[PDB]
Amino acid sequence: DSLRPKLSEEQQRIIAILLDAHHKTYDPTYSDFCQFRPPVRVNDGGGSVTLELSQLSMLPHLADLVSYSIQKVIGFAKMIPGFRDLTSEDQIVLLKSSAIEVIMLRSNESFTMDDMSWTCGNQDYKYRVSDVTKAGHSLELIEPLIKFQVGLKKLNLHEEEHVLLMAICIVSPDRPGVQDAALIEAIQDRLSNTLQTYIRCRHPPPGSHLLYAKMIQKLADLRSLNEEHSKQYRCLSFQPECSMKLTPLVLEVFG
Ligand SMILES: C=C1/C(=C\C=C2/CCC[C@@]3(C)[C@H]2CC[C@@H]3[C@]2(C)C[C@@H](CC(C)(C)O)CO2)C[C@@H](O)[C@H](C)[C@@H]1O
C-alpha cells in the first residue's frame, strides 16, 4: 500500500552534495594519522584506573585524532544544504553539541566486526577498547559505544543513508542554547524527508524494514553516549597536566 514518491531533483542534489562533502572530509586511508602525537600503550592488562590516569598513555594520540575529526566535521557541516542559512551563533551551538556524536557515527566506517576494533592501518593505528581505557575512560562509556558500533553496522546503511544521518544529527533543533529552533527544524526536516524518501524508493527489502525508525533510535543512542562521554571527560579533566594532552579545540568543545 505504501506509496514510493520518487526523490525530487532537489533531494537528489542534497544527496550528491552530502556524498561530496563526506568524500572531501573523510580520508578512508587515514593517511594523516602519522602527523598526530604517537600512540603509546602502557602495560595495563589489569585495567588499573590509577595507572591509566597516572600515564594517560593513549590520550595525546586519541585527542589529536578526535581534534582532527572535529575539524573535518566542521567542514562537513558547512556543506550541509541550509546550514549556512543559520546564524554563526546557532552554527557553533550545533557543532559543539554534536561533535562527539558525529565522531562516533563517522567512526563506524573504520570500525570492523572482524575483531571489534577501529582499524585505521597497521598495528599502531588499530584502536581497541583497551586504548580507550588507556585514555582515561571507563566501561560505562565503552560498553554502550561498542554496542552502538555493532548495531549501526548491522543496519548495513547505504553511504547515502550514512551521510544523511550525520547531517540530521548535526542539524538538531533540540540542542540547548539554540536560538532559531524553527529554522533548524526546517533544515532538518528537508534532510529527514530526503532520507525517508530515499529508504522507501532505493533501499531493497528486508534491510529497509522499519529502517528509518532504527536510524532515529541510533540518534537517541548517540545522545546517551554524549552525556556519558561528557561526565567522564569532566573527571578526566581533574587529572593534573591533562590539558597538555588534549588540544585547544578539544578543550573548548568538551570543557
Ligand atoms: C575518530 C574517528 C576514528 C575512530 C574513532 C574511535 C577510535 C578511538 C577511540 C574513539 C576516538 C573512537 C570513537 C570514540 C572513541 C573515544 C571514546 C573518544 C575519545 C574521548 C576523549 C579522550 C577525547 O575524551 C577517547 O575514545 C577513525 C576514523 O573513522 C575517523 C577519523 C573518525 O573520525
The SS-based structural class is: mainly alpha
Query: Which fold does the CATH topology refer to?
Result: Retinoid X Receptor
Describe the oligomeric state of these chains in a short phrase: monomer
User: Major sheet, described briefly?
Assistant: 3 strands, antiparallel
The shape, in one word, is globular
CATH class wording: Mainly Alpha
Ligands: the ligand C=C1/C(=C\C=C2/CCC[C@@]3(C)[C@H]2CC[C@@H]3[C@]2(C)C[C@@H](CC(C)(C)O)CO2)C[C@@H](O)[C@H](C)[C@@H]1O
Q: Strand portion, in percent?
A: under 5%
Superfamily (CATH H level) name: Retinoid X Receptor
Give the helix level as a range of percent: 55-70%
Fold and architecture overview:
The protein is an all-alpha fold. It has a single domain (1-255), classed as Orthogonal Bundle (Retinoid X Receptor). The chain is 60% helix and 3% strand. It has eleven helices and three strands. The protein has a three-stranded antiparallel sheet. A hairpin with a 4-residue loop joins strand 1 and strand 2 (117-119). Helix 1 packs across helix 7, helix 3 (59-78) crosses helix 4 and helix 6 runs antiparallel to helix 9. The protein is globular and about 60 Å long. The termini are far apart. 30% of the residues are buried. The structure holds ligand 23R. Residues 62-63, 65-66, 69, 103-104, 106-107, 109-110, 118, 120, 127, 132, 135, 137, 233, 250 line the site of ligand 23R. It is classed as gene regulation. Keywords: Transcription, Structural Genomics, spine2, Structural Proteomics in Europe 2, gene regulation, spine-2. It forms a monomeric assembly.
